[PDB]
Symmetry: none
Subunit: 360 residues, 2 copies
């Protein structure tokens, strides 16, 4: 029973850590643009289809290797996806594209109990990302784990709001206020990272890459044992929930001050402790091609009292320390450029614990 994980904090025993190797800049299509900050559009326009800067990838490789050494030191078993050249151009009957990477296992795999679920994805450049994780998954399957792949979308034009006001306008907030994004409800689609676990309750966010159809597929697939709840925040470009509402312990959650939750009262009434982290200190000159500066709260809990946090983010380190949480500082400043922190770069396969309810 290699696979077994019901939440984000029980004692970690096995984890999959991503890879920065052969990462490619995704072609600049509507869904990519909806996620990209104005500042990087020229980069995407010129670099699409080519590898991310190799000198930059080399630094990320080193940072992640070190992170892996630390995990092993802390007694965690680490598995890595297979090395693949993401520059290969593939073609389905609906579209043609080059790949992205297998850096973020949290984007594609989620473990609920004894079951590993491969998310469908919503980006064309991520259609074949599952290929990097098959060796690992088959091994767990041969050893008893349940294996599920949610319905792979066609990703035909009908899935995208080709006329979304990505070009800056901010009324993204308005459509966003209406649950209206760059992805339509044409077919189910989602990234596993828009879901965050808390035992019997899983919380999901309708985002640029996760639609209501996708969430309903999860809700219907996991019921009656798990309840999937939809929550929202003040955020014009949502893509993943772990840098917005990261649950770090039974009844304790980190809420991004810039992205308040519309349903925060549900948690307050539940007696949950809402902690608002201090702002990131990451320099504005450091390239964050795929995310915001908020990767600092994208922490990974080795257990209730041990957190893997960024070596450079001192303010948030102090915060955990005043709460009695031992900080394991690792530097992943360059790996951050690919779009993720510790929670995104990993997928907890096994945590020592049982299924419980923390919402009462």
């Amino acid at each position: 029973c290699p696979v077994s994980s019901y939440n984000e904090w029980d004692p970690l025993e096995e984890v999959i850590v991503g890879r920065a190797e052969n990462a490619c800049v995704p072609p600049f299509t509507i869904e990519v643009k909806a996620n990209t900050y104005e500042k990087y559009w020229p980069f995407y326009q010129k670099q699409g289809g080519h590898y991310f800067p190799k000198d930059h990838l080399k630094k990320a490789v080193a940072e992640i290797e070190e992170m892996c050494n630390i995990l092993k030191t802390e007694g965690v078993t680490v598995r890595r996806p297979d090395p693949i050249d993401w520059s290969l151009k593939y073609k389905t009957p609906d579209f043609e594209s080059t790949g992205l990477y297998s850096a973020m296992p949290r984007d594609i795999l989620i473990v609920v109990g004894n079951e590993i679920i491969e998310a469908p994805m919503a980006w064309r450049s991520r259609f074949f990302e599952y290929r990097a994780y098959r060796s690992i998954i088959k091994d767990y399957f041969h050893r008893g784990a349940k294996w599920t792949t949610a319905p792979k979308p066609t990703m035909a034009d009908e899935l995208y709001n080709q006329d979304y006001p990505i070009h800056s306008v901010e009324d993204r907030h308005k459509l966003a206020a209406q649950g209206k994004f760059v992805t339509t409800e044409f077919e189910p689609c989602f990234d596993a990272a828009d879901f965050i676990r808390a035992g019997r309750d899983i919380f999901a966010q309708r985002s640029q890459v996760t639609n209501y159809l996708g969430i309903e597929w999860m809700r219907r697939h996991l019921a009656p044992d798990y309840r999937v709840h939809i929550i929202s925040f003040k955020d014009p470009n949502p893509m993943h929930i772990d840098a917005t509402f990261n649950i770090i312990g039974p009844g304790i959650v980190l809420s991004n001050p810039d992205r308040p939750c519309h349903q925060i009262d549900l948690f307050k009434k539940a007696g949950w402790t809402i902690i608002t982290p201090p702002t990131p200190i990451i320099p504005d000159d450091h390239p964050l091609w795929m995310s915001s500066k908020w990767l600092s709260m994208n922490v990974l809990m080795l257990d209730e009292k041990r957190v893997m946090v960024d070596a450079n983010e001192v303010p948030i380190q102090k915060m955990f320390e005043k709460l009695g949480i031992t900080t394991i500082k690792v530097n992943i400043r360059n790996a951050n450029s690919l779009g993720g922190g510790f929670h995104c770069w990993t997928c907890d396969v096994r945590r020592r614990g049982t299924l419980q309810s923390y919402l009462d």
Copy 2:
């Protein structure tokens, strides 16, 4: 400027490919025994001084001729050593012996920049192996290349640990752990194949045929432009590094799973990608008189994306293919019996590129 090569992967333009003709079984002396698997001792004991099985040499000749046709097809200029009868018994003031062959140019010649260096060797049966390559080297010399022959050893008894526990014992590992092998530090000796190039950094291994004196001679001879680093692996019978740690691209290396590198962290910290190839599928009944089954990772790179790999080794072919490397499959199953794969059977004379650093 016919000669010019700084690493193992830049676009190949000229290469020397060995010959299987008149190859002779070396006399069974201490240094030969230290390299021979128990399974072949009777062969060496009875065949020493005579030609390797002629019906077997004929198959190797054919395989190598084909390999040469492919190289020419791929636009590589191929040179071959001169045909020599290796059965001639020679006598120096220190010893008497019959020769071996000129099948492995990688064993005796290494190109660093515009300079071709003839290694000294450490086996008595290989004392006069350079004679087969003189016509080629003088031509390059007349055309501007630098030519260097490292100090030829006396190969007197003092160079060999006459009481080495070759007779099986495995504590070879222990002496090996102490950098202690069948060759003493009596005088400089080495095979060029214990060195593998990566621009400004060359890595060497102290092995059964390459001592610290030999490595220091290289380090001192190439400084300050090149840095020669010594690395070690878990290996009781080392002889050459290219089937243990074969560097295939800038920052990418194939590490033999059976022979882990003690200094792997130096490379991990450098952001290098360490790939571990799958096991060879070569039958245990096929005679490998001079090596292990690991000849499968002894690949030759025509360039960063083109590799010449064994036609029979499908698993490793698949591996390169998933990495986006075009596989040029050639069958050299019989040539393998003489002791080498593609990297051993060749010596890259000219690769299109410049001197660079890949270790940062």
